[PDB]
Design a protein around this nucleic acid. Structure first.
Ligand SMILES: [Mg+2]
Ligand SMILES: [Mg+2]
Ligand SMILES: [Mg+2]
Ligand SMILES: [Mg+2]
Ligand SMILES: [Zn+2]
Lengths: 225, 267, 102, 129, 64
RNA sequence: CUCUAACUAUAAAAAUCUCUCUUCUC
């Protein structure tokens, strides 16, 4: 479609000659620590690239970090903070679900319960965590709906909120992520609300992040290798 | 005979705006002679003909006349062109008409030369056309320069001196163009004697009428005095009339009267 | 006269519901007179399942689906073939059209 | 891993002029942006499957020249308040991307879906046609 | 290049088009006979013909 | 007398019309 009224209001090169590849190194809380490669402009004395990498947020499937496929529908965002030269080191930045699974579990004829909590971890990191649960049809329910009363929903939200506050205030996102990978918090939340309501598909989705204290060098290098 | 495209290649280029003379129409589309380039036909698709919805083929095609066009795809093994007419902007057609007019003037001049000399137009283009286009970028601009500055034909080998001589004769006879630089001065004099001052300013202005640029003070009304010059270079007349303005102001200020500027020297 | 004892709305005890927009023509129509269709499909059709399977790492990918509930208007629903005019003795039936496939 | 250099395909298919725009894992680095309208004449068959096919072939050639051998599909509809249903071209774009040697991993749909926000364009009675 | 390929029809999927003069078939390549396309034909065909295609990524879409 | 699976997807333009209406009983 050449049509262009040239309302502009050759010195051409190949930008790929002045570029190269860095390597993404995952935290030791994950198994497959070799994530991938990132394309970067060549280093310049006036404008060093190492400044340019830091702040990058790579988005990788969780199953790509642990080899299994039980974590297929999760997703983790890593933050580039420290570059060792031809290889850079990444810290945890956030967590999320895949929209496919989320829409797969958000089905009709059952009430979804959302618990939202903003807390501070063991260190100065400040997190926001969303938990989503779905009422479960009993294994004997001839009634075809599986709705939950507002009182049950409020009780469930209270329980999930207190559980998340407990499990965040008692550990750091190193330990918190090492806890998120085997999704033991989901099982604990489901067990704590077994008496209130069945609560199928108790999941923790979109673990956000809002603050970072200064840099936290020593643990960052300790988190790798 | 009419052949030998103006531009660099007989076959066209990619995305080059072209310039069509339609000959006939088939069911698929219009096969159209290309006049910007040498002779080779282009295919204008029916679905890519009209800006508006297609309703009357012959109303828009106008078999036997010239129009604007744009090339989309080219074939560089045997010769085929895909063309469009819908996708022409409002402003591009103007540059298309001017390019057509200048290229057609050059074509007519050199076809006249070839018909007089009975040598194929391609050979005359070999000796005249594209070395000139390499030197100046446009054969018509170089023709205008040769009208003014004859160093244009230096460094090029013509088939014969007669070719260049008769080309110069034709270009001087047909491509003959001097811009009328006109200004208006308001004499607001109220002093005792101004007719003598007006005559002195007249003489001061008219004495500087050079051999090629004759500046004349024409008289129409009492306040409005016209200053006329034939600027051949268009960059000297304005200074001539500015000097005339300085002279008339110098003459008028000391006598007692005043003068005002109404229209400065402009093309 | 009453063409529909339910008035087509399916409201019966609310007075007012919050309207939703049409996916095609963006008609501000009440959420119950907004005939809904849950399009659940594969992100890659059966026409490219073999091609994707042959040319994909992660052997036996789950091939995730795509889910979208479409909120049509009613004029589009008649025109975009979603819903069809019916016999006045067939308007009685509210069951979906008999399980497209078993 | 056998050193499959990865990118994200990140197809964007509206109801006109689908987009194929491959980037690295970070996404801050953009390469081979060539679109659907990049390669068709009719100004409206930009959404046609053939436009997306040609765009996909071009990006596949460019990235294969680059060094990236496998891509991650991120299908995006027009999103927002609009129809947010995938465009006709993006499907053929994905098929052609999977055709040209490139390996495929982690197809995702990343369309922006709102929480019933920012009242839709068209007026109360909408587009009348 | 000249990527002319052949494709033998294995089944004919009725006749389509506003004119009603074009047909739709399922073609399978002379090579790799497990790889098939759906393609539009403009002319009389039956089970056994060998169409010539300048494309292979194209798939037939019902003409309206 | 025993069961919950498959899927898509077009909207060009088209205004108007004058007479004159006539029984059903074995
Ligand atoms: Mg009625
Ligand atoms: Mg209804
Ligand atoms: Mg009431
Ligand atoms: Mg209508
Ligand atoms: Zn509608």
């Amino acid at each position: 479609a050449v049509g262009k009224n040239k309302r502009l209001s050759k010195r051409v090169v190949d930008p790929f000659t002045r570029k190269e590849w860095y390597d993404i190194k995952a935290p030791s809380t994950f198994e497959n620590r070799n994530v991938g490669k990132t394309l970067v402009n060549k280093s310049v004395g006036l404008k060093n690239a190492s400044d340019s990498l830091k702040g990058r947020v790579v988005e990788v499937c969780l199953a790509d970090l642990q080899g299994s496929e039980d974590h297929s529908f999760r997703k983790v965002k890593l933050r580039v903070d420290e570059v060792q030269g031809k290889n850079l080191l990444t810290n945890f930045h956030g967590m999320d679900f895949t929209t496919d699974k989320l829409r797969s579990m958000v089905r009709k004829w059952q009430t979804l319960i959302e618990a939202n909590v903003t807390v501070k971890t063991s260190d100065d990191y400040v997190l926001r965590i969303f938990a989503i649960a779905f009422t479960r049809k009993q294994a004997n329910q001839v009634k075809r709906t599986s709705y939950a009363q507002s009182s049950h929903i409020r009780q469930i939200r209270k329980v999930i909120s207190e559980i998340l506050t407990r499990e965040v205030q008692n550990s750091t996102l190193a330990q918190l992520t090492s806890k998120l990978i085997p999704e033991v918090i989901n099982k604990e939340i489901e067990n704590a609300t077994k008496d209130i309501f069945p609560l199928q598909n108790v999941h923790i989705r979109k673990v956000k992040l809002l603050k970072q204290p200064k840099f936290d060098l020593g643990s960052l290098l300790s988190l790798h290798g | 005979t009419s052949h030998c495209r103006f531009y660099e290649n007989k076959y066209p280029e990619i995305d080059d705006i072209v310039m069509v003379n339609v000959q006939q129409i088939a069911e698929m589309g219009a096969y159209v002679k290309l006049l910007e380039y040498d002779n080779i036909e282009g295919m204008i698709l029916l679905s890519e003909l009209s800006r508006r919805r297609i309703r009357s083929i012959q109303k828009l095609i106008r078999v036997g006349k010239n129009d604007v066009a744009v090339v989309l795809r080219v074939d560089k093994e045997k010769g085929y062109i895909d063309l469009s007419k819908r996708r022409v902007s409002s402003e591009d057609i103007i540059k298309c008409e001017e390019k057509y007019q200048k290229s057609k003037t050059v074509h007519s001049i050199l076809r006249y030369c070839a018909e007089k000399f009975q040598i194929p137009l391609e050979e005359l283009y070999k000796t005249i056309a594209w070395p000139l286009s390499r030197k100046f970028g446009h054969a018509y601009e170089a023709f205008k320069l040769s009208i003014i500055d004859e160093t244009v034909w230096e460094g090029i080998e013509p088939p014969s001196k007669d070719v260049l001589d008769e080309l110069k004769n034709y270009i001087s006879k047909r491509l003959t163009p001097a811009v009328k630089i006109r200004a208006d001065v308001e004499v607001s004099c109220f002093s005792y004697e101004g007719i003598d001052a007006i005559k002195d300013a007249l003489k001061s202005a008219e004495d500087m009428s050079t051999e090629q640029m004759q500046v004349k003070v024409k008289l129409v009304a009492a306040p409005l005095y016209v200053l006329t010059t034939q600027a051949l270079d268009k960059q000297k007349g304005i200074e001539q009339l500015e000097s005339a303005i300085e002279k008339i102001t110098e003459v008028i200020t000391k006598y007692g009267g005043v003068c005002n500027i109404t229209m400065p020297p402009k093309a | 006269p009453k063409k529909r004892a339910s008035n087509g709305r399916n409201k019966k005890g609310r007075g007012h519901v919050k309207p939703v927009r049409c996916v095609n023509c963006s008609r501000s129509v009440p959420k119950d007179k907004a005939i809904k269709r849950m399009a659940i499909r594969n992100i890659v059709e059966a026409a490219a399942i073999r091609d994707l399977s042959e040319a994909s790492v992660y052997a036996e990918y789950a091939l995730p689906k795509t889910y979208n509930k479409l909120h049509y208007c009613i004029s589009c629903a008649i025109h975009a073939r979603i819903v069809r005019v019916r016999s006045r003795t067939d308007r009685r039936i509210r069951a979906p059209p008999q399980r497209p496939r078993f | 891993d056998n050193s499959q250099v990865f990118g994200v395909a990140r197809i964007f298919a509206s109801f006109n002029d689908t987009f194929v725009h491959v980037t690295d894992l970070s996404g801050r680095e953009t390469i081979a942006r060539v679109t659907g309208g990049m390669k068709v004449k009719a100004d409206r068959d930009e959404s046609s499957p053939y436009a997306a096919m040609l765009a996909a072939q071009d990006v596949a050639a460019k990235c294969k020249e680059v060094g990236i051998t496998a891509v991650h599909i991120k299908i995006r509809a027009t999103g927002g308040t609009r129809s947010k249903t995938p465009g006709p071209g993006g499907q053929a774009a994905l098929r052609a991307l999977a055709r040209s040697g490139l390996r495929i991993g982690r197809i995702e749909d990343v369309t922006p879906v709102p929480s019933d926000s920012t009242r839709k364009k068209g007026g109360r009675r909408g587009r009348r046609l | 290049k000249t990527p002319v390929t052949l494709a033998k029809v294995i089944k004919v999927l009725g006749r389509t088009g506003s004119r009603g003069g074009v047909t739709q078939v399922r073609v399978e390549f002379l090579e790799d006979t497990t790889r098939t396309i759906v393609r539009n034909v403009k002319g009389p065909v039956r089970e056994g013909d060998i169409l010539v295609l300048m494309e292979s990524e194209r798939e037939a879409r019902r003409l309206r």
